[PDB]
Design an enzyme around this catalytic site. Sequence first.
Site, PDB file in Angstrom:
ATOM      1  N   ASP A 149       0.808  -1.206   0.000  1.00 21.98           N
ATOM      2  CA  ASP A 149       0.000   0.000   0.000  1.00 21.98           C
ATOM      3  C   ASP A 149       0.847   1.264   0.000  1.00 21.98           C
ATOM      4  OD1 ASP A 149       0.966  -0.162   2.601  1.00 21.98           O
ATOM      5  OD2 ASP A 149      -1.019  -0.021   3.542  1.00 21.98           O
TER       6      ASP A 149
ATOM      7  N   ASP B   4       7.794  -4.208  13.823  1.00 19.41           N
ATOM      8  CA  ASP B   4       8.416  -2.893  13.754  1.00 19.41           C
ATOM      9  C   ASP B   4       8.622  -2.249  15.119  1.00 19.41           C
ATOM     10  OD1 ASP B   4       5.590  -2.856  13.538  1.00 19.41           O
ATOM     11  OD2 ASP B   4       5.630  -0.761  12.885  1.00 19.41           O
TER      12      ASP B   4
HETATM   13  O1  UDP Z   1      -2.099 -11.721   6.772  1.00 21.16           O
HETATM   14  C1  UDP Z   1      -1.467 -10.775   6.360  1.00 21.16           C
HETATM   15  C2  UDP Z   1      -1.966  -9.299   6.383  1.00 21.16           C
HETATM   16  C3  UDP Z   1      -1.012  -8.324   5.807  1.00 21.16           C
HETATM   17  N1  UDP Z   1       0.237  -8.694   5.295  1.00 21.16           N
HETATM   18  C4  UDP Z   1       1.129  -7.687   4.740  1.00 21.16           C
HETATM   19  O2  UDP Z   1       1.833  -6.955   5.734  1.00 21.16           O
HETATM   20  C5  UDP Z   1       1.921  -5.542   5.379  1.00 21.16           C
HETATM   21  C6  UDP Z   1       1.172  -4.735   6.447  1.00 21.16           C
HETATM   22  O3  UDP Z   1      -0.212  -4.837   6.240  1.00 21.16           O
HETATM   23  P1  UDP Z   1      -1.210  -3.673   6.368  1.00 21.16           P
HETATM   24  O4  UDP Z   1      -0.727  -2.584   5.458  1.00 21.16           O
HETATM   25  O5  UDP Z   1      -2.584  -4.224   6.096  1.00 21.16           O
HETATM   26  O6  UDP Z   1      -0.965  -3.222   7.865  1.00 21.16           O
HETATM   27  P2  UDP Z   1      -1.293  -1.798   8.509  1.00 21.16           P
HETATM   28  O7  UDP Z   1      -0.429  -0.741   7.840  1.00 21.16           O
HETATM   29  O8  UDP Z   1      -2.774  -1.653   8.400  1.00 21.16           O
HETATM   30  O9  UDP Z   1      -0.786  -1.940  10.004  1.00 21.16           O
HETATM   31  C7  UDP Z   1       1.450  -5.447   3.913  1.00 21.16           C
HETATM   32  O10 UDP Z   1       2.545  -5.605   3.002  1.00 21.16           O
HETATM   33  C8  UDP Z   1       0.541  -6.657   3.754  1.00 21.16           C
HETATM   34  O11 UDP Z   1       0.448  -7.202   2.439  1.00 21.16           O
HETATM   35  C9  UDP Z   1       0.693 -10.035   5.280  1.00 21.16           C
HETATM   36  O12 UDP Z   1       1.816 -10.349   4.827  1.00 21.16           O
HETATM   37  N2  UDP Z   1      -0.164 -10.995   5.805  1.00 21.16           N
HETATM   38 MN    MN Z   2      -0.638  -0.383   5.644  1.00 18.40          MN
END
Ligand code: UDP
Ligand code: MN
Length: 342
Positions: free
Chosen positions: A108, A186
Amino acid sequence: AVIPILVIACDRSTVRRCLDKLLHYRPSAELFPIIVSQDCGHEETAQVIASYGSAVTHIRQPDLSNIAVQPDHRKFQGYYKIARHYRWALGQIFHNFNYPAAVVVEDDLEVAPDFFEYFQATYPLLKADPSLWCVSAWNDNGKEQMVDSSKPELLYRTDFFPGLGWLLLAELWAELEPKWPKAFWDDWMRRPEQRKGRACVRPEISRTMTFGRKGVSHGQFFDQHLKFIKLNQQFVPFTQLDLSYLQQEAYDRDFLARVYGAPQLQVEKVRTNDRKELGEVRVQYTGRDSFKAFAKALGVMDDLKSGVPRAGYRGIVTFLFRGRRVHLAPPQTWDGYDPSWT
Ligand SMILES: O=c1ccn([C@@H]2O[C@H](COP(=O)(O)OP(=O)(O)O)[C@@H](O)[C@H]2O)c(=O)[nH]1
Ligand SMILES: [Mn+2]
């Protein structure tokens, strides 16, 4: 040097937006191979990735089972899955493909036109300076009104690991993998046991921006902060610039002298734009309460991870406020971060 871009994907077809920008700006397929690691098994997303053909290498996380979480984490299964995928994908990059480094990009993220130029120019720095552990494209306080648009080339060191488009060496993966966490990778890297006082390079103007309002995390942080980071659009030829000022020996002398040599101004005067003749000032904080109060007064991120402020370096948060360069800084007697500052 061959630096792969590891794109982490799962179930958002908008990985298309991410890949379109990476492929449009990529200066060399040989120097920047793109490896898209997809978790989850979402068919539409897989079809989108596959449609790029040989422009990318599509690999798939093998274990799609549910993960047994600890008692305090029933609502956080997604974060366990993210951590598991990162471990597998980075293992593929460093153990199977055996690359020397990688730039990690979540699906994203939209990259800036000089995203590749930036990492190509900073990789040598990371290789040479052991006090650095990453190069990140993200400025945590990179909102449009808080960055100097006339200085798109300006870079800094930061103690706060920013993630969101970051370069790491195979050497760091060697250190992290044996103790990789079950979740919240992280924030885990932000702990002193992992960071070990090391910094990352980060820009005045972010080289990535996120559009992932809907994702694993509830959208509040995206809605109140992430969505406002300005993506750089002015190409900077970093490989043609002298980045020696980022070496620790030079930076810790010059940047610190600059910060503490700047005149001190009370936060209220900065806030109301008094004393405009002072184009660069220091607003001093002396404790956790004043740090949060002053950060909030000036629109700066006020949360702390393991006692480190967003984009902070030796406790100093640098940004622009109504055209003025401001360094929100601790007294010069500063001697380390206190994790109890929460
Ligand atoms: O079961 C899962 C859900 C998410 N992701 C990945 O981990 C990253 C973080 O996901 P997301 O952006 O949805 O997290 P947020 O920014 O909402 O904390 C992205 O590259 C997703 O494709 C993954 O590998 N497995
Ligand atoms: Mn995200």
